[PDB]
Amino acid sequence: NNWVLLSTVAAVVLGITTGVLVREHSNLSTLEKFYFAFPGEILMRMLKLIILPLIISSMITGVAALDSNVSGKIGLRAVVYYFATTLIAVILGIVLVVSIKPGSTVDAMLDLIRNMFPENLVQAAFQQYKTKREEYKIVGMYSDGINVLGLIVFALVFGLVIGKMGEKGQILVDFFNALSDATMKIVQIIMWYMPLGILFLIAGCIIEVEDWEIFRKLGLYMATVLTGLAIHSIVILPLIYFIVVRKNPFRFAMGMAQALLTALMISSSSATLPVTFRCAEENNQVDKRITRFVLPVGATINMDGTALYEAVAAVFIAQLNDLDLGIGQIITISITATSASIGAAGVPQAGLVTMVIVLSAVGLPAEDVTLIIAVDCLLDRFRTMVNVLGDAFGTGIVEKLSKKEL
Numbered sequence: 381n382n383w384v385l386l387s388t389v390a391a392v393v394l395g396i397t398t399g400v401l402v403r404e405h406s407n408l409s410t411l412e413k414f415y416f417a418f419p420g421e422i423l424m425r426m427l428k429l430i431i432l433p434l435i436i437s438s439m440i441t442g443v444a445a446l447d448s449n450v451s452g453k454i455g456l457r458a459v460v461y462y463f464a465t466t467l468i469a470v471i472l473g474i475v476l477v478v479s480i481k482p483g484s485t486v487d488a489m490l491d492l493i494r495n496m497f498p499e500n501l502v503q504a505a506f507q508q509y510k511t512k513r514e515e516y517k518i519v520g521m522y523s524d525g526i527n528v529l530g531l532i533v534f535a536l537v538f539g540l541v542i543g544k545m546g547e548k549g550q551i552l553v554d555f556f557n558a559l560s561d562a563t564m565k566i567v568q569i570i571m572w573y574m575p576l577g578i579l580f581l582i583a584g585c586i587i588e589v590e591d592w593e594i595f596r597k598l599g600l601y602m603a604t605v606l607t608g609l610a611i612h613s614i615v616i617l618p619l620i621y622f623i624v625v626r627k628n629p630f631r632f633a634m635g636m637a638q639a640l641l642t643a644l645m646i647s648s649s650s651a652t653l654p655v656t657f658r659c660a661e662e663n664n665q666v667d668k669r670i671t672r673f674v675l676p677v678g679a680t681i682n683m684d685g686t687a688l689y690e691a692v693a694a695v696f697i698a699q700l701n702d703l704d705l706g707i708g709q710i711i712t713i714s715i716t717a718t719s720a721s722i723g724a725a726g727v728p729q730a731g732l733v734t735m736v737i738v739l740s741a742v743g744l745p746a747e748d749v750t751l752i753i754a755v756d757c758l759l760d761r762f763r764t765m766v767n768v769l770g771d772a773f774g775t776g777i778v779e780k781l782s783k784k785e786l
């Protein structure tokens with residue numbers, strides 16, 4: 381049945397209708413606005429709850445599944461596609477934001493390498509490492525926030541080891557195969573509550589807006605992000621698919637319409653993963669051998685929409701703060717945005733938590749994420765669509781390159 385998609389679409393229209401009517405005909409205070417958004421807050425807790433189980437077991441399962449003999453090349457072909465498309469999205473975003481103009485870096489760069497290799501695996505599950513220079517001597521502290529970057533590196537390295545251990549490591553492959561299946565089943569349970577949670581998430585965001593003048597202030601910023609997301613989705617990604625796979629890229633995209641439409645409502649690449657599998661494997665007839673690796677791994681590692689949005693958002697905030705941006709500052713933004721997209725989880729608002737790392741890399745407060753938080757719900761919806769579209773296209777791109785091994 382179509383209840384999953386029809387109900388989710390009905391949640392979005394009811395959230396906008398609920399949010400606009402409540403905003404106009406009611407005078408909710410700050411506390412009442414927070415309580416009104418509570419049902420959507422609980423959905424965020426449910427989605428953040430499965431972030432760690434899903435990311436860890438997805439990375440281990442995908443890499444471990446790849447047969448060591450030759451499927452490793454299939455894995456390498458994917459990471460090159462993931463990195464190339466994210467760089468293109470980041471570069472495209474910086475060009476658009478710099479052209480349109482809508483509005484201590486070493487320590488931050490070194491913190492990205494430190495977080496790739498956490499000192500503790502349990503601590504990396506809910507804490508991150510930050511260094512500051514004080515007197516100058518570097519002082520490091522562990523602050524809250526799951527270190528997704530460190531877990532990804534270990535989970536991929538762990539998946540590589542157990543996959544290559546043959547029968548000695550089969551129990552670990554069986555363990556994380558079942559764990560990955562269980563996490564996806566739990567995500568399906570959360571989809572029963574998502575229509576209600578999404579209703580108050582969209583409604584709550586609209587109610588928070590005060591006078592609609594900020595939307596006018598942020599209108600050009602949204603155009604830059606929406607223009608970049610449109611260019612990457614409609615021009616760049618189809619162009620890459622056509623070159624590698626001499627097939628109509630837009631016919632391939634039509635087969636993903638349910639997944640793309642699902643992502644445009646729930647704003648979660650991990651939550652829409654089951655739809656991406658169904659669309660890629662059945663509508664597009666992509667091999668399940670490579671789909672079972674590209675999609676679950678790319679649901680969090682390949683985020684072109686987030687990477688573009690992080691670069692545009694960071695440069696836009698810098699423009700607002702009247703902060704000059706040299707070639708060096710632009711380059712660190714590109715690196716930080718690329719890592720921020722990797723560290724972002726396939727959940728609504730993931731892009732905001734990782735933007736603090738991008739803002740700090742150029743010396744900006746972590747509280748400047750509230751200069752663009754008003755319209756994040758809309759821009760987050762389109763981020764996810766491009767994030768999952770990248771994985772879907774990469775699924776067909778990797779399959780073409782892996783004809784010899786399949």
Ligand SMILES: [Hg+2]
Pocket residue numbers: 581582585586754755756757758
């Ligand atoms: Hg919103």
Ligand code: NA
Pocket residue numbers: 461462463464465466467681682683684770
């Ligand atoms: Na990418």
Ligand code: NA
Pocket residue numbers: 649678679680681682683684767768770771
């Ligand atoms: Na993705």
Ligand code: NA
Pocket residue numbers: 679680681682683720721722723724725726
């Ligand atoms: Na990510």
